[PDB]
Write a protein that holds these residues in place. Structure first.
Motif, short mmCIF file in Angstrom:
data_model
loop_
_atom_site.label_atom_id
_atom_site.label_comp_id
_atom_site.label_asym_id
_atom_site.label_seq_id
_atom_site.Cartn_x
_atom_site.Cartn_y
_atom_site.Cartn_z
N UNK A 278 0.79 -1.27 -0.09
CA UNK A 278 -0.14 0.10 0.00
C UNK A 278 0.86 1.28 0.02
N UNK A 279 2.20 1.32 -0.20
CA UNK A 279 2.93 2.59 -0.11
C UNK A 279 3.39 2.58 -1.70
N UNK A 280 2.67 3.87 -2.09
CA UNK A 280 3.11 4.14 -3.49
C UNK A 280 4.79 4.47 -3.71
N UNK A 281 5.20 3.92 -4.62
CA UNK A 281 7.01 4.10 -4.95
C UNK A 281 6.81 4.91 -6.34
N UNK A 282 6.70 4.27 -7.25
CA UNK A 282 6.67 4.71 -8.76
C UNK A 282 5.80 4.12 -9.94
N UNK B 280 9.46 13.90 0.75
CA UNK B 280 10.16 12.79 0.11
C UNK B 280 9.84 11.56 1.13
N UNK B 281 8.69 11.18 0.80
CA UNK B 281 8.12 9.73 1.32
C UNK B 281 7.23 9.14 0.36
N UNK B 282 6.86 7.86 0.54
CA UNK B 282 6.03 7.18 -0.31
C UNK B 282 4.64 7.53 0.28
N UNK B 283 3.71 8.00 -0.65
CA UNK B 283 2.31 8.16 -0.30
C UNK B 283 1.54 6.90 0.00
N UNK B 284 0.51 6.75 0.75
CA UNK B 284 -0.22 5.53 1.01
C UNK B 284 -1.30 5.60 -0.34
N UNK B 285 -1.63 4.69 -0.84
CA UNK B 285 -2.76 4.48 -1.51
C UNK B 285 -4.21 4.97 -0.57
#
Ligand SMILES: *Cc1c(COP(=O)(O)O)cnc(C)c1O
Ligand SMILES: *Cc1c(COP(=O)(O)O)cnc(C)c1O
Lengths: 271, 271
Positions: free
Chosen positions: A164-168, A212-217
């Motif tokens: 659930x962590x958006x990367x790219x 600069x963090x991974x946004x969650x779904x």
């Protein structure tokens, strides 16, 4: 002119005539790295950061560079001059025939694809695109490898969302716009995008706060906007991720403003 | 007469001479599936199970089969005849030049590598091998894709141990032995190895209890033995996994028993 080219074995060939030995571990084992270099005003954008990322991709993959970076720059500049148009350039570094007892690909091949640039259709900038979230990551995230199998197997692109962590994206850096802030995965997890870098510099000059963090779904219901970045697509608005509408479902104000500022400023990053 | 061969474009060529167009998405995007077929006394082992898994891999990858399985069998048999020796055969199905509007690779190429078989050195069967555990999985684990990049970058082989659950090797099925029981990852997580299937069949005939679960890294201090399987390597003993010695650090009783039963029984799976 508009003739597609492939530089291989010392020669600029017609792209359709260029062939690689089937002994190459690019074909047999997916051992290869590449870049996408694009032009504005027939000048290569971010040529040095691209050629340094190519070397880092090859070196992180235990591939010895088959040519110097000065030699790759010379080829890419000469191939651009032959094209006489806006060019998409893809240098490939292959594994070659052998992984030696010293754990290196020492007989690497290279070739350089030159094509006329094919921007995404204007309709996709006007309406934005949909992304397909998968519970998967790129391993070796700093390496731009030739492995796109997962990208193929009606969304524009897959989005790597491990746990659930958006990367790219498969091809693209992902930005979220949420509480006025630009949110993007750190390059410990996402490829060091050259477009990503230019957008973060334009964000700094615009006094736009960057997380600069991974946004969650799970944050996507509260987001105002999203876009994806790459040298060819520039900034492409993202209006849907899976079945979640982003904001009001149309390209947002800040995405369009950063796209305009990118096109106004782009000459500063040309070489 | 004798040479390594590549069947490509309707012709048996020297392996050294055979070339693939750089437009092929196997090169550009790692869109490829393959098999490894070995011979015993020049008969192809598990030819039909290998070709059916090749069709499975292509189908799961949205690749339309560029030839029939009967046509592939005829090529593989004729190429074995031409070799005049014990052969390792690798049929490759490529993506070809385009992913069409219908989300299929409809212009697939195929080629068939024939090489004189190269077994692992006898010292590796006598001493056994070491595996390097990584916190990573194969995505689409039922597809035998050309993507082995992580096998070289990330020891005889890497061992995919997502969240400390052992799944499989990069090239090989993994078996653990604990209190005389054979433990191996289920085909819900691991490639359905043809050597794997043979060992499970020979275990069942031997009244050797099989557990189809992923063994934990934390079970390795309690294990008697471990081995890996693949058509060329047969059963290769595994004596070390990262810093953990397996058993008493030498090939175990049941591994050497299953290897002899595999060699004794092999003719029933020849075609
Ligand atoms: C190539 C690529 C990008 C975009 O890189 P740019 O330098 O902006 O063109 C982003 N993410 C991934 C995974 C890529 O492979
Ligand atoms: C090819 C392969 C195997 C071995 O399968 P065999 O049919 O026994 O040769 C195991 N694991 C992976 C991931 C493979 O690619």
């Amino acid at each position: 002119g508009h003739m597609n080219l492939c530089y291989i074995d010392g020669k600029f060939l017609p792209l359709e005539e260029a062939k690689l030995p089937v002994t190459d571990l690019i074909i047999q084992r997916g051992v290869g790295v590449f870049e996408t270099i694009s032009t504005h005003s027939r000048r290569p954008l971010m040529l040095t950061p691209h050629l340094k990322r190519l070397e880092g991709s090859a070196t992180a993959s235990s591939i010895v560079m088959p040519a110097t970076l000065d030699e790759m720059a010379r080829i890419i500049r000469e191939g651009i001059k032959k094209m006489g148009c806006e060019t998409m350039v893809r240098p490939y570094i292959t594994g070659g025939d052998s992984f030696g007892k010293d754990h290196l690909f020492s007989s690497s091949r290279y070739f350089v694809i030159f094509e006329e640039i094919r921007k995404p259709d204007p309709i996709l900038y006007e309406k934005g695109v949909a992304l397909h979230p998968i519970n998967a990551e790129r391993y070796l995230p700093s390496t731009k490898s030739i492995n796109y199998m997962l990208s193929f197997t009606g969304a524009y692109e897959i989005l790597y969302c491990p746990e659930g962590e958006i990367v790219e994206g498969s091809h693209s850096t992902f930005f979220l716009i949420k509480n006025g802030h630009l949110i993007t995965a750190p390059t410990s997890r996402a490829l060091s995008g050259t477009t990503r870098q230019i957008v973060l510099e334009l964000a700094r000059r615009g006094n736009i706060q960057v997380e600069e963090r991974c946004p969650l779904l799970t944050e996507l219901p509260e987001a105002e906007e999203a876009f994806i970045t790459g040298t060819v697509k520039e900034l492409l608005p993202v209006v849907r991720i899976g079945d979640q509408i982003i904001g009001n479902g149309v390209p947002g104000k800040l995405t369009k403003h950063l796209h305009q500022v990118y096109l106004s400023s782009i000459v500063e990053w040309l070489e």
